[model samples]
Target: LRSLSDSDFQLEVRQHPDPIIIMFTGSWCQPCKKMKPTFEEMASQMEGDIRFAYMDAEDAEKTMAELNIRTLPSLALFVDGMIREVFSGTMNKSDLRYWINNNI
Candidate 1:
């Protein structure tokens, strides 16, 4: 539900209770910039308690390296500290919702 930093990555993502969907974005990534509002909207509109968060590409470089984030904009689904799936790219609400449905 918020932007993540390396300091809180443990408490927020690894220790999170619900299924967490975290997105990775870079400052120069146009796609990430475009999708920012939509991601926030999805977080609010999506039913249930699924948690959503995002990280800066360089701000959280340590976390990013560990996650093997090779692209500018990426998304990962985590539950109980383990990764379930990873996705990427720009999208529509319908598309992201479909992804959520498939995973959730």
Candidate 2:
């Protein structure tokens, strides 16, 4: 998965034609640590189907606030540059896959 900076968000995700799934995380959050690998694995497997990226909540304070992200490990699904779905907390590989399948 790619790490998205604030500038990259506007230049890449917002302008890209494909759908995006962004994981909002924090370095200090244990749950975020645990979910990182799961998210990455899914990203690799679904590489051509959907765009996967992550943003550090601390580093992207403005983006996080705009998304109303109150949780450490949050998943935001963006279609056509607009957030269509959002869920917070940790999810297993199967759950993550199912969620993505349903959303996309």
Candidate 3:
């Protein structure tokens, strides 16, 4: 999946057949910058099995507020358009993979 805009979030989530991972990130966020590559790597590894997308937190203020996001670099997994899990702050790649496998 690619970085999505506010207008595309609903369509992407509702129309996607596979589980969706939405990574909320800001340009100035160091952690987001760091985790971005990892997320990309995992997305590549997962390939067709999952959908990994991202949003610019600064640009999508309305979407962020609608999602009730209170922090930078918040990661949310949506299965069938509903949130299944969310992680804020920093996270481990292994833990993220486990959660996606079992929960998402």
Candidate 4:
């Protein structure tokens, strides 16, 4: 998955044309760590049609603050550069894939 920074939030996410899924994560968040690999693998497999990315909740505080993200681990679906939905907690790869496809 692509790593996003507060500095490039607009360039990478806001201006992105395709539907993108962003995982907001923090190093100390236990579930986030567990879910990361699954997300990255999904990103690699779905390379072109969909863009998957992750943002450090600790490092990208500004983006998190602006997005009103108070949780340690969260997920957002951005369609046409605007947030359409936000989720929390974690899910297995299969469940996540099904959820994503149903939403988009």
Candidate 5:
């Protein structure tokens, strides 16, 4: 997954035609570390069909606040420039995939 900054939300993801999945993470969060690999793998597998990215919660404090992100390792799906779903905490690969499939 590519690293996304606050501007990318408007400059890139909002303009993209496909659904975008963004994980809000913090370097200091252990759960974020554990979910990183799974997020990467799913991004690879779903490339072209879905846009996957990660934003540092620390760096993008304003964006996080705008999105009402209360926890690290939060997952959000955006479609048509609007947020569709928000999930908190860690999810295994299979469950993540299933959630994506059902939503996307």
Candidate 6:
């Protein structure tokens, strides 16, 4: 997943005009670390159909606050630049795939 900074968050997520999966994580977050590999594997499976990106909560505080992200690791799916679904907490690969397939 490509890491995002506040400077480019809006441009990447809102203006990209593509389906996006935004993973909210922190450098020291255990859940985030655990979920990373699975998330990457799933993302790879999707190939070019979807875009996956990440935002470090510690670095992008304003964006996180504006997005109302309350958890350490939040998975959000956006279709056509709008949030279609969200999976909070630490989620397994199956749950993530289910939400993405069902929601998008």
Query: How do all models score by TM-score?
Result: 0.88, 0.93, 0.89, 0.88, 0.92, 0.92
Model 2 Cα lDDT, one tens digit per residue, 1-104: 67887767887777888999999988789999999999999998988888988998767787888889888799999989888889889999999999988988
The better-scoring model by TM-score among 1 and 2 is 2
Report the error of model 5 at residue 33, Å: 0.6
- Of candidate 3, the 10-residue stretch with the lowest lDDT total is 9-18
Give the Å error, residue 26, model 4: 1.0
Best by lDDT: 2
On residues 20-83, what C-alpha lDDT tens digit does candidate 3 reach at each position? Answer: 8888998888988888888888899888787888889766787788888867788888887788
- Model 6: colliding residue pairs: none
Tens digits of per-residue lDDT, candidate 1, 1-104, equal: 57898998888888878788888988888889888888889999864768888888767888878888777688888877788878867777888888877877
| Local accuracy of candidate 4 as per-residue lDDT tens digits, 1-104 | 56888988798788979989889998788998899998888888777877988889767889888888777678888888898878877888998888788787
Which runs in model 6 stand beyond 4 Å of their true positions? none
- Tens-digit lDDT track of model 6 for 1-104: 68888888778887889898988898788988999998898899997888888888877788778778888799888887777877788878898888788987
Candidate 4 residue spans exceeding 4 A from truth: none
Highest TM-score: which candidate?
A: 2
Model 3 off-target regions past 4 Å?
none
Q: Relative to the unseen true structure, what is the C-alpha lDDT of residue 20 in candidate 4, on a scale of 0 to 100?
A: 91
Native RMSD of candidate 3 (Å): 1.5
State which candidate, 2 or 6, has the greater lDDT: 2
Worst ten-residue run, lDDT, model 4? 64-73
Query: If both were scored by lDDT, which would come out higher, candidate 3 or candidate 4?
Result: 4
